[PDB]
Amino acid sequence: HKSEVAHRFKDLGEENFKALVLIAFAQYLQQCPFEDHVKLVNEVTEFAKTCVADESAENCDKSLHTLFGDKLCTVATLRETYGEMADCCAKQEPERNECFLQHKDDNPNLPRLVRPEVDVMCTAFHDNEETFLKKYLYEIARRHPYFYAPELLFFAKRYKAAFTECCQAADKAACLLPKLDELRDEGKASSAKQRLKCASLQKFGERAFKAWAVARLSQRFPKAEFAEVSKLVTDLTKVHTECCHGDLLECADDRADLAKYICENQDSISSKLKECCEKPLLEKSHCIAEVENDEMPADLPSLAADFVESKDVCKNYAEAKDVFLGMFLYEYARRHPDYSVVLLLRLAKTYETTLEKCCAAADPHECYAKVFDEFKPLVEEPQNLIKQNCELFEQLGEYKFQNALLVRYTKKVPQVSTPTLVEVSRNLGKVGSKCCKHPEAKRMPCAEDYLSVVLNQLCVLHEKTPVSDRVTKCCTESLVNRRPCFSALEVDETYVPKEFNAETFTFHADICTLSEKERQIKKQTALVELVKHKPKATKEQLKAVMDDFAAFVEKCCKADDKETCFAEEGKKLVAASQAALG
Ligand SMILES: CCCCCCCCCCCC(=O)O
Ligand SMILES: CCCCCCCCCCCC(=O)O
Ligand SMILES: CCCCCCCCCCCC(=O)O
Structure with missing residues (x-):
């Protein structure tokens, strides 16, 4: 704590600093013109630089939250344009800020952004490359005010890459077009999960969120100790709660911190994260989140020993039910990176259900006796689905495969709108091509991740316009029974x-x-x-x-x-x- 701006400027850089300030100011005043934000950013940056000169320069002491709301309130047209929000400016700090992300719009009513012609783009790019990217950054920023700034900046850099490379190519379009299409869907998948993860937190609550992260974190860090996983699962959950709220600064710091922690205790966590920990502040967390699984140690015991044989399982269970189950998860998870997180949760629930209907019996050790046996069916079902569907995606191909789906689902829920059925069976076919590629070891995880957004994208529609009681049934079920439910739907x-x-x-x-x-x-x-x-x-x-x-x-x-x-x-x-x- 020496001087807010100065410090951020210092370990961010003028370039990244200037870009983030724009994104942030655009996710709030999403109704203001470009030429207007460009002045703020210049005013703010001219400030951060003043502070860098003399940390004691006027106002360099203030908190970023305070300095920010101060700038926001200097928008003389704030009342006429945003109205109600201009009311925030009358409050003190803590509630001024809160007032602001309260009036953040989730669905700006702005015109869809159209993709110009490759030649117009490339020429705009060539003539004024900064204002070309800033303008578009600004355009996507205001359309998605809940998108984690730093992540949005990450995509921008990928855009400037695709342009830089393609605009100087032969079939410029042959080059540019497929990149933009890949970026688009990636950015859209990214944003759908951000929104999806926050929604799951809202309904299902901390516990299920915690059970999900334990299985996922412990699949990635198989060498970490359950106490370390819990430490992280605890800090992780606090991060999502914070970030979901929408406060970028609070959320940034929270992510920055958890990343510092993981990097300092990296040997205690995993080996596959060396590179990520040598990266700059801005990409540390992003890197780590996308890190690859570590190799699970080679002396891994047989669960059935601590969780199905050894008596006292009921004694250790009743003593602290969640820590024990959480232990079962962590244990089963790290031993199975080839499972979907949901499948793991599906097994823990089954385990839990049994422990409950068994520890309350004369002879329990003989009750929960054949338990691992009940796991079997639960594992086979998603496996068979992946096999036959990838097998089919082979003898057919993307398009002809998409048709097989189309026919298959249209019969299940004929009530579903046609443009909707098409969209869904189209994105579904894509999942088949994107996952059926990898060995069976990385398939289920792959599928789970894609299906999750696709299934949610489908339920969101069905919300604003119910058409089937069945689709609504699965859509309202636990984010764990969601897919099996849809899978169970029968021909109508x-x-x-x-x-x-x-x-x-x-x-x-x-x-x-x-x-x-x-x-x-x-x-x-x-x-x-x-x-x-x-x-x-x-x-x-x-x-x-x-x-x-x-x-x-x-x-x-x-x-x-x-x-x-x-x-x-x-x-x-x-x-x-x-x-x-x-
Ligand atoms: C003027 C505002 C400065 C921008 C503050 C955000 C800093 C982001 C740091 C990256 C945090 C992370 O690792 O996710
Ligand atoms: C903190 C670990 C808690 C372990 C809970 C075991 C049950 C996991 C399933 C949670 C989702 C659900 O109940 O449908
Ligand atoms: C838009 C209506 C279509 C609903 C079907 C959703 C597909 C779920 C995928 C599960 C794989 C399967 O078992 O077919």
């Missing part, structure tokens, strides 16, 4: 098919000139609709119809007076098909 026999169309099954020659992406969506949408008119159709009946329409498409997108092909030939298809599906 109750469903009453919509009336046949022709308009829905009409195709004009534009598909021949559409982007594969748009061509697939078109074909896929029709497929969903097709299954909704005959959800009792076979994989046989359906394949045929699907082939005939494929040939037909190519067989008209290679003709002439071809608007006629679609119409003339299409009438024969929709007609012959109607008959096949009865």
Whole structure:
């Protein structure tokens, strides 16, 4: 504690400092123009530099929280633009700040950000590279005010990389386009988990959050001691609570600290984190969070000894139920990095359930006797699902695989909107290609991580617009029974098919000139609709119809007076098909 700004400036750097101040000021005053924030950042940076000169310079003593709210309140148009928020400026510190993140908007009503043309971008990049990146940083900052600043800055650097490299290439687009698409989805996946992790905290509460982190932290640091895991799981949870609240500074410091701790006691935690601990302040935590699993020691005993044989399991259990279970988790976790965290939690719950319905019996040691036996089924189910689905993703391929899903889920919840079913089965197919790549050792974990966001993205929609009681059932269940529930959904026999169309099954020659992406969506949408008119159709009946329409498409997108092909030939298809599906 010598001088807030000065210190942050000092071990952050003018470049990173200037970028973070912008992001922070943009996540609050999300309605102010660019040219307006650029002045603040310059005013603030001119300040931090004044302080660097003389730590005793006026106001260099103030707290970042105080100095910040002070700047925010100097926005003369704060009342006219933000109104209610301008009311915050009348309060003292602690409640001024609070007042501010209270009025932080989660869903700014701003125009979707459109991706310009590679050549326009690259030329903007070439002419004024800083204002080009700052403007876009500012644009994504205000659209996601709850996105952890430092992480947002991390993506920016990846953007400047892709541009720098591609803008000086041959098929600039061939280069640039796939990068931006990868970045987009990554940034979106990152933001979905940030929001998802905070929501799980809200509903399910600290305990389940704690049980999740023990299994996950102890899978990564198999060499750490349960007391060290707990220390971390404790500090970790405090970090998420803090960060979820939205206070960047408080959240930053909390992450900075936990990172210092882990790096100092790194040998006591893991070996695979050397590099991360040599990195600059800004990337220490980010690095560590993404660190790879350490190798689990080679003298690892058999659980059944301490948790299923040895009497007193009930004595050690009742003495401190959670610490014991937490021990079971830590133990089972580090021995299984090939399991999804949920699967582990699924086993601890089963263990817990048993200990409870057994320690309360004359002979307990013989009650919870065959317990590890009940674990078996629980492990096989997610394994089989991954096998058959990756097996299928092989003989089919991404697109044709996505169709198999489309057909499969459309029959389960026919009530679900079509543009929604498509979106979901599309992202689901992607998970198959992104995970079916790695040995079976890193598959389940992979799948769990992707499915989690996808399943949540789906439930969020179903919220604002309930359509099925079933989807809502799984969506409201424990973040642990969520997936198995969906997996359990059965073909909707109750469903009453919509009336046949022709308009829905009409195709004009534009598909021949559409982007594969748009061509697939078109074909896929029709497929969903097709299954909704005959959800009792076979994989046989359906394949045929699907082939005939494929040939037909190519067989008209290679003709002439071809608007006629679609119409003339299409009438024969929709007609012959109607008959096949009865
Ligand atoms: C003027 C405001 C300075 C910005 C404060 C945020 C500092 C972020 C430090 C990185 C913390 C972390 O490791 O996550
Ligand atoms: C701090 C460790 C606590 C261990 C609790 C064992 C049960 C884990 C499952 C939590 C999720 C749930 O109850 O559905
Ligand atoms: C949008 C409605 C579709 C709902 C299905 C969600 C898919 C869950 C994936 C679980 C894998 C499986 O068992 O099929």
